[PDB]
């Protein structure tokens, strides 16, 4: 019932600090920091633990992975991925964590690795067609969606969906606007693509995907443009956390109500964070 903002970049330093948001009180507080600073980190929740996957520590693109236990307020390393990835998208489906795309320091990646917490092992699955760093990933009705990103040459509006029964990626309908550094969340049967960068502009626009019609539509924009934004869903609202508006790394946080189609500000974090990972536990 809390939102965790993990790592990121405050405009001067890559962060290992972590803050947690309580909606009952509308306040952020620090929890235990990670061992390794990570911006462009992917964050997933599985079986009562938060996983911080990859990222960039200011000198190295990371293949290491840390797990947070809220009962002990402790981070521990688990098995590393084979390939280092910053700007990686992370999703959980059927008891596995998927690390999707990213950048390894030399190459934008279309490879995908899956983590089994019981064996503490990563293994490769089918790669996507298009390489994507700064990709947003979400899970809806048994599929993983890889949304937008940057392939090394172009900012992408294409979207691919992964079916674990067939181990295959397939394109679905593209967004209207290309977005890298996009935040993606699932709420009430729709995927929301929040913010990002289209190659010329940092975005405050938001598009919603309905898988029944295979169509994207614009919804209300946020007040502040945000690329490198973290997005999470809690108690029926979507939270857009931090990011970069084109001039400033942000500690502000906006919440979206789909019934009113409105964004409103909530309490800001203490530390500005772009390239931040966000998850709900």
mmCIF file of C-alpha atoms in Angstrom:
data_model
loop_
_atom_site.group_PDB
_atom_site.id
_atom_site.type_symbol
_atom_site.label_atom_id
_atom_site.label_comp_id
_atom_site.label_asym_id
_atom_site.label_seq_id
_atom_site.Cartn_x
_atom_site.Cartn_y
_atom_site.Cartn_z
ATOM 1 C CA UNK A 1 0.000 0.000 0.000
ATOM 2 C CA UNK A 2 3.020 2.248 -0.513
ATOM 3 C CA UNK A 3 4.763 3.646 -3.599
ATOM 4 C CA UNK A 4 8.545 3.250 -3.688
ATOM 5 C CA UNK A 5 10.713 5.653 -5.709
ATOM 6 C CA UNK A 6 14.045 3.878 -6.268
ATOM 7 C CA UNK A 7 17.279 5.560 -7.328
ATOM 8 C CA UNK A 8 17.359 7.974 -10.238
ATOM 9 C CA UNK A 9 19.453 11.044 -10.973
ATOM 10 C CA UNK A 10 18.994 14.355 -9.162
ATOM 11 C CA UNK A 11 20.824 16.530 -11.677
ATOM 12 C CA UNK A 12 24.237 16.113 -9.987
ATOM 13 C CA UNK A 13 24.372 12.557 -8.574
ATOM 14 C CA UNK A 14 23.171 9.063 -9.391
ATOM 15 C CA UNK A 15 21.146 8.015 -6.353
ATOM 16 C CA UNK A 16 21.060 4.927 -4.170
ATOM 17 C CA UNK A 17 18.394 6.468 -1.906
ATOM 18 C CA UNK A 18 14.799 5.203 -1.872
ATOM 19 C CA UNK A 19 11.665 7.032 -0.702
ATOM 20 C CA UNK A 20 8.252 5.550 0.099
ATOM 21 C CA UNK A 21 4.907 7.338 -0.303
ATOM 22 C CA UNK A 22 1.936 6.743 1.997
ATOM 23 C CA UNK A 23 -1.356 8.005 0.488
ATOM 24 C CA UNK A 24 -3.159 8.023 3.850
ATOM 25 C CA UNK A 25 -0.781 10.698 5.114
ATOM 26 C CA UNK A 26 0.343 12.206 1.754
ATOM 27 C CA UNK A 27 3.983 12.097 2.708
ATOM 28 C CA UNK A 28 7.223 10.619 1.429
ATOM 29 C CA UNK A 29 9.865 9.224 3.755
ATOM 30 C CA UNK A 30 13.212 7.562 3.185
ATOM 31 C CA UNK A 31 13.625 3.812 3.584
ATOM 32 C CA UNK A 32 16.869 1.846 3.418
ATOM 33 C CA UNK A 33 19.122 2.817 0.479
ATOM 34 C CA UNK A 34 20.408 0.385 -2.095
ATOM 35 C CA UNK A 35 24.075 -0.580 -2.084
ATOM 36 C CA UNK A 36 24.624 0.598 -5.665
ATOM 37 C CA UNK A 37 23.400 3.944 -7.059
ATOM 38 C CA UNK A 38 21.197 3.362 -10.096
ATOM 39 C CA UNK A 39 19.578 5.701 -12.571
ATOM 40 C CA UNK A 40 17.638 4.290 -15.494
ATOM 41 C CA UNK A 41 16.745 1.383 -13.186
ATOM 42 C CA UNK A 42 13.877 -1.059 -13.674
ATOM 43 C CA UNK A 43 11.781 -1.902 -10.627
ATOM 44 C CA UNK A 44 9.373 -4.825 -10.155
ATOM 45 C CA UNK A 45 7.447 -6.319 -7.235
ATOM 46 C CA UNK A 46 7.258 -10.084 -6.854
ATOM 47 C CA UNK A 47 6.296 -12.183 -3.823
ATOM 48 C CA UNK A 48 6.603 -9.385 -1.285
ATOM 49 C CA UNK A 49 9.940 -8.119 -2.531
ATOM 50 C CA UNK A 50 10.955 -5.159 -4.676
ATOM 51 C CA UNK A 51 13.633 -5.837 -7.273
ATOM 52 C CA UNK A 52 15.913 -3.073 -8.559
ATOM 53 C CA UNK A 53 17.239 -4.308 -11.910
ATOM 54 C CA UNK A 54 20.205 -2.845 -13.735
ATOM 55 C CA UNK A 55 20.669 0.876 -14.227
ATOM 56 C CA UNK A 56 23.730 3.096 -14.347
ATOM 57 C CA UNK A 57 25.831 3.998 -11.326
ATOM 58 C CA UNK A 58 27.607 7.030 -12.801
ATOM 59 C CA UNK A 59 30.540 4.995 -14.189
ATOM 60 C CA UNK A 60 29.103 1.631 -15.240
ATOM 61 C CA UNK A 61 25.990 0.176 -16.845
ATOM 62 C CA UNK A 62 24.854 -2.494 -14.420
ATOM 63 C CA UNK A 63 23.869 -6.131 -14.624
ATOM 64 C CA UNK A 64 23.478 -6.392 -10.838
ATOM 65 C CA UNK A 65 20.087 -6.801 -9.151
ATOM 66 C CA UNK A 66 19.070 -5.993 -5.568
ATOM 67 C CA UNK A 67 15.964 -7.131 -3.686
ATOM 68 C CA UNK A 68 14.263 -5.183 -0.915
ATOM 69 C CA UNK A 69 12.418 -6.850 1.954
ATOM 70 C CA UNK A 70 10.093 -4.311 3.623
ATOM 71 C CA UNK A 71 9.807 -6.466 6.758
ATOM 72 C CA UNK A 72 13.514 -6.043 7.510
ATOM 73 C CA UNK A 73 14.062 -2.752 5.586
ATOM 74 C CA UNK A 74 17.082 -4.345 3.905
ATOM 75 C CA UNK A 75 18.412 -4.580 0.340
ATOM 76 C CA UNK A 76 20.366 -7.674 -0.752
ATOM 77 C CA UNK A 77 21.992 -8.654 -4.042
ATOM 78 C CA UNK A 78 20.440 -11.540 -5.966
ATOM 79 C CA UNK A 79 21.700 -13.152 -9.170
ATOM 80 C CA UNK A 80 22.890 -10.659 -11.817
ATOM 81 C CA UNK A 81 21.600 -10.645 -15.350
ATOM 82 C CA UNK A 82 23.851 -11.796 -18.153
ATOM 83 C CA UNK A 83 23.711 -8.458 -19.988
ATOM 84 C CA UNK A 84 24.102 -5.050 -18.279
ATOM 85 C CA UNK A 85 21.090 -2.814 -18.922
ATOM 86 C CA UNK A 86 20.294 0.786 -18.140
ATOM 87 C CA UNK A 87 17.064 2.337 -19.343
ATOM 88 C CA UNK A 88 15.591 -1.179 -18.955
ATOM 89 C CA UNK A 89 11.887 -1.986 -18.654
ATOM 90 C CA UNK A 90 10.859 -4.503 -16.014
ATOM 91 C CA UNK A 91 7.604 -6.452 -15.634
ATOM 92 C CA UNK A 92 6.274 -9.390 -13.623
ATOM 93 C CA UNK A 93 4.149 -12.099 -15.237
ATOM 94 C CA UNK A 94 3.302 -15.560 -13.846
ATOM 95 C CA UNK A 95 5.981 -15.693 -11.178
ATOM 96 C CA UNK A 96 8.839 -14.387 -13.300
ATOM 97 C CA UNK A 97 10.472 -10.975 -13.685
ATOM 98 C CA UNK A 98 11.212 -9.897 -17.243
ATOM 99 C CA UNK A 99 14.047 -7.483 -18.007
ATOM 100 C CA UNK A 100 13.262 -5.959 -21.415
ATOM 101 C CA UNK A 101 15.672 -4.067 -23.647
ATOM 102 C CA UNK A 102 17.905 -1.325 -22.303
ATOM 103 C CA UNK A 103 21.432 -0.183 -23.121
ATOM 104 C CA UNK A 104 24.569 -2.136 -22.166
ATOM 105 C CA UNK A 105 27.067 0.701 -22.605
ATOM 106 C CA UNK A 106 27.737 0.021 -26.299
ATOM 107 C CA UNK A 107 24.451 -1.268 -27.763
ATOM 108 C CA UNK A 108 20.717 -0.637 -27.513
ATOM 109 C CA UNK A 109 19.185 -4.005 -26.798
ATOM 110 C CA UNK A 110 16.289 -6.055 -28.069
ATOM 111 C CA UNK A 111 17.178 -9.011 -25.829
ATOM 112 C CA UNK A 112 14.944 -10.021 -22.921
ATOM 113 C CA UNK A 113 15.870 -11.978 -19.799
ATOM 114 C CA UNK A 114 13.541 -13.693 -17.318
ATOM 115 C CA UNK A 115 14.221 -14.208 -13.606
ATOM 116 C CA UNK A 116 13.013 -17.181 -11.563
ATOM 117 C CA UNK A 117 13.225 -16.279 -7.842
ATOM 118 C CA UNK A 118 12.960 -19.931 -6.763
ATOM 119 C CA UNK A 119 16.125 -20.924 -8.690
ATOM 120 C CA UNK A 120 17.673 -17.405 -8.456
ATOM 121 C CA UNK A 121 18.507 -17.591 -12.138
ATOM 122 C CA UNK A 122 18.141 -15.363 -15.197
ATOM 123 C CA UNK A 123 17.604 -16.878 -18.638
ATOM 124 C CA UNK A 124 17.118 -15.411 -22.095
ATOM 125 C CA UNK A 125 13.711 -15.611 -23.780
ATOM 126 C CA UNK A 126 12.711 -14.481 -27.269
ATOM 127 C CA UNK A 127 14.094 -11.031 -28.214
ATOM 128 C CA UNK A 128 11.888 -8.238 -29.423
ATOM 129 C CA UNK A 129 12.042 -7.154 -33.046
ATOM 130 C CA UNK A 130 13.141 -3.612 -32.284
ATOM 131 C CA UNK A 131 15.916 -2.608 -29.862
ATOM 132 C CA UNK A 132 14.533 -0.327 -27.143
ATOM 133 C CA UNK A 133 16.232 1.591 -24.353
ATOM 134 C CA UNK A 134 14.178 3.957 -22.229
ATOM 135 C CA UNK A 135 11.276 1.558 -22.853
ATOM 136 C CA UNK A 136 8.108 1.359 -20.753
ATOM 137 C CA UNK A 137 6.843 -2.106 -19.880
ATOM 138 C CA UNK A 138 3.549 -3.248 -18.418
ATOM 139 C CA UNK A 139 1.552 -6.443 -18.036
ATOM 140 C CA UNK A 140 -2.098 -6.762 -19.016
ATOM 141 C CA UNK A 141 -4.201 -9.916 -19.424
ATOM 142 C CA UNK A 142 -1.315 -12.330 -19.715
ATOM 143 C CA UNK A 143 0.849 -10.299 -22.063
ATOM 144 C CA UNK A 144 3.873 -8.031 -21.552
ATOM 145 C CA UNK A 145 3.776 -4.798 -23.543
ATOM 146 C CA UNK A 146 7.009 -3.029 -24.510
ATOM 147 C CA UNK A 147 6.050 0.574 -25.272
ATOM 148 C CA UNK A 148 8.163 3.067 -27.204
ATOM 149 C CA UNK A 149 11.820 3.554 -26.351
ATOM 150 C CA UNK A 150 14.848 4.459 -28.443
ATOM 151 C CA UNK A 151 16.497 2.053 -30.886
ATOM 152 C CA UNK A 152 19.810 3.863 -31.256
ATOM 153 C CA UNK A 153 18.612 5.995 -34.173
ATOM 154 C CA UNK A 154 14.972 6.915 -33.618
ATOM 155 C CA UNK A 155 12.541 7.491 -30.785
ATOM 156 C CA UNK A 156 9.803 4.916 -31.173
ATOM 157 C CA UNK A 157 6.021 4.963 -31.221
ATOM 158 C CA UNK A 158 5.817 1.212 -31.921
ATOM 159 C CA UNK A 159 4.600 -1.249 -29.280
ATOM 160 C CA UNK A 160 5.292 -4.992 -29.067
ATOM 161 C CA UNK A 161 3.449 -7.586 -26.978
ATOM 162 C CA UNK A 162 4.975 -10.783 -25.575
ATOM 163 C CA UNK A 163 3.005 -14.014 -25.179
ATOM 164 C CA UNK A 164 4.778 -16.443 -22.802
ATOM 165 C CA UNK A 165 2.766 -19.439 -24.060
ATOM 166 C CA UNK A 166 4.362 -19.074 -27.527
ATOM 167 C CA UNK A 167 7.576 -17.233 -26.487
ATOM 168 C CA UNK A 168 6.870 -14.674 -29.207
ATOM 169 C CA UNK A 169 6.740 -10.872 -29.553
ATOM 170 C CA UNK A 170 4.181 -9.329 -31.922
ATOM 171 C CA UNK A 171 3.542 -5.712 -32.846
ATOM 172 C CA UNK A 172 0.285 -4.148 -31.682
ATOM 173 C CA UNK A 173 -1.091 -0.713 -32.554
ATOM 174 C CA UNK A 174 1.517 2.079 -32.345
ATOM 175 C CA UNK A 175 1.089 5.175 -30.240
ATOM 176 C CA UNK A 176 0.464 8.517 -31.934
ATOM 177 C CA UNK A 177 3.517 10.135 -30.333
ATOM 178 C CA UNK A 178 7.003 8.555 -30.194
ATOM 179 C CA UNK A 179 8.205 8.340 -26.595
ATOM 180 C CA UNK A 180 11.472 7.290 -25.032
ATOM 181 C CA UNK A 181 11.907 7.549 -21.284
ATOM 182 C CA UNK A 182 8.175 6.866 -21.018
ATOM 183 C CA UNK A 183 6.335 5.658 -17.917
ATOM 184 C CA UNK A 184 3.774 2.891 -18.378
ATOM 185 C CA UNK A 185 1.048 1.717 -16.005
ATOM 186 C CA UNK A 186 -2.003 -0.527 -16.192
ATOM 187 C CA UNK A 187 -5.295 0.540 -14.639
ATOM 188 C CA UNK A 188 -8.759 -0.962 -15.171
ATOM 189 C CA UNK A 189 -8.027 -2.765 -18.401
ATOM 190 C CA UNK A 190 -6.065 0.011 -20.050
ATOM 191 C CA UNK A 191 -2.362 0.697 -20.479
ATOM 192 C CA UNK A 192 -1.292 4.314 -19.969
ATOM 193 C CA UNK A 193 1.809 5.735 -21.653
ATOM 194 C CA UNK A 194 2.820 8.780 -19.594
ATOM 195 C CA UNK A 195 5.238 11.467 -20.724
ATOM 196 C CA UNK A 196 8.546 10.681 -22.356
ATOM 197 C CA UNK A 197 10.577 12.368 -25.077
ATOM 198 C CA UNK A 198 9.632 12.374 -28.753
ATOM 199 C CA UNK A 199 13.034 13.402 -30.083
ATOM 200 C CA UNK A 200 12.284 17.139 -30.018
ATOM 201 C CA UNK A 201 10.140 17.742 -26.928
ATOM 202 C CA UNK A 202 9.757 16.463 -23.387
ATOM 203 C CA UNK A 203 6.118 15.408 -23.151
ATOM 204 C CA UNK A 204 3.233 16.052 -20.799
ATOM 205 C CA UNK A 205 0.810 14.112 -23.012
ATOM 206 C CA UNK A 206 -0.662 10.743 -21.987
ATOM 207 C CA UNK A 207 -2.100 8.008 -24.220
ATOM 208 C CA UNK A 208 -4.297 5.083 -23.153
ATOM 209 C CA UNK A 209 -4.402 1.724 -24.912
ATOM 210 C CA UNK A 210 -7.485 -0.469 -25.046
ATOM 211 C CA UNK A 211 -6.505 -4.028 -26.043
ATOM 212 C CA UNK A 212 -10.121 -4.858 -27.021
ATOM 213 C CA UNK A 213 -10.031 -2.269 -29.869
ATOM 214 C CA UNK A 214 -6.199 -2.268 -30.326
ATOM 215 C CA UNK A 215 -6.361 1.540 -30.283
ATOM 216 C CA UNK A 216 -4.461 4.316 -28.479
ATOM 217 C CA UNK A 217 -6.243 7.545 -27.490
ATOM 218 C CA UNK A 218 -5.077 10.700 -25.741
ATOM 219 C CA UNK A 219 -6.365 11.358 -22.226
ATOM 220 C CA UNK A 220 -5.747 14.424 -20.055
ATOM 221 C CA UNK A 221 -2.125 15.660 -20.100
ATOM 222 C CA UNK A 222 -0.113 16.211 -16.956
ATOM 223 C CA UNK A 223 0.676 19.724 -15.821
ATOM 224 C CA UNK A 224 4.446 19.187 -16.011
ATOM 225 C CA UNK A 225 6.262 17.496 -18.934
ATOM 226 C CA UNK A 226 8.240 14.484 -17.740
ATOM 227 C CA UNK A 227 10.723 12.210 -19.446
ATOM 228 C CA UNK A 228 12.511 9.547 -17.461
ATOM 229 C CA UNK A 229 9.368 9.462 -15.310
ATOM 230 C CA UNK A 230 8.361 6.624 -12.987
ATOM 231 C CA UNK A 231 4.729 5.505 -13.015
ATOM 232 C CA UNK A 232 2.779 3.356 -10.550
ATOM 233 C CA UNK A 233 -0.841 2.493 -9.775
ATOM 234 C CA UNK A 234 -2.244 2.469 -6.236
ATOM 235 C CA UNK A 235 -5.846 2.635 -4.939
ATOM 236 C CA UNK A 236 -7.279 3.431 -8.369
ATOM 237 C CA UNK A 237 -4.937 6.295 -9.246
ATOM 238 C CA UNK A 238 -1.882 6.540 -11.493
ATOM 239 C CA UNK A 239 1.096 8.331 -9.981
ATOM 240 C CA UNK A 240 3.648 10.079 -12.194
ATOM 241 C CA UNK A 241 6.828 10.416 -10.117
ATOM 242 C CA UNK A 242 9.759 12.707 -10.850
ATOM 243 C CA UNK A 243 11.322 12.879 -14.282
ATOM 244 C CA UNK A 244 12.882 15.709 -16.282
ATOM 245 C CA UNK A 245 10.898 18.549 -17.878
ATOM 246 C CA UNK A 246 13.590 19.726 -20.297
ATOM 247 C CA UNK A 247 15.217 22.171 -17.852
ATOM 248 C CA UNK A 248 14.878 20.635 -14.384
ATOM 249 C CA UNK A 249 15.044 17.248 -12.705
ATOM 250 C CA UNK A 250 11.806 16.925 -10.787
ATOM 251 C CA UNK A 251 10.731 15.934 -7.308
ATOM 252 C CA UNK A 252 7.069 16.725 -8.009
ATOM 253 C CA UNK A 253 4.450 13.968 -8.237
ATOM 254 C CA UNK A 254 1.077 14.045 -10.005
ATOM 255 C CA UNK A 255 -1.851 11.656 -9.559
ATOM 256 C CA UNK A 256 -4.392 10.758 -12.247
ATOM 257 C CA UNK A 257 -8.036 9.910 -11.571
ATOM 258 C CA UNK A 258 -9.474 8.068 -14.605
ATOM 259 C CA UNK A 259 -13.090 8.719 -13.566
ATOM 260 C CA UNK A 260 -12.609 12.502 -13.650
ATOM 261 C CA UNK A 261 -9.819 12.396 -16.296
ATOM 262 C CA UNK A 262 -7.765 14.793 -14.201
ATOM 263 C CA UNK A 263 -4.178 15.067 -12.938
ATOM 264 C CA UNK A 264 -3.477 16.729 -9.580
ATOM 265 C CA UNK A 265 -0.306 17.363 -7.606
ATOM 266 C CA UNK A 266 0.358 15.422 -4.404
ATOM 267 C CA UNK A 267 3.268 15.762 -1.977
ATOM 268 C CA UNK A 268 6.681 16.033 -3.702
ATOM 269 C CA UNK A 269 9.552 13.761 -2.866
ATOM 270 C CA UNK A 270 12.523 15.135 -0.963
ATOM 271 C CA UNK A 271 15.024 14.358 -3.731
ATOM 272 C CA UNK A 272 14.550 15.156 -7.435
ATOM 273 C CA UNK A 273 14.748 11.963 -9.494
ATOM 274 C CA UNK A 274 14.801 11.387 -13.241
ATOM 275 C CA UNK A 275 15.367 7.872 -14.559
ATOM 276 C CA UNK A 276 13.663 6.697 -11.365
ATOM 277 C CA UNK A 277 12.129 3.253 -10.854
ATOM 278 C CA UNK A 278 8.751 3.108 -9.149
ATOM 279 C CA UNK A 279 6.765 0.215 -7.741
ATOM 280 C CA UNK A 280 3.876 -0.465 -5.377
ATOM 281 C CA UNK A 281 4.019 -2.876 -2.473
#
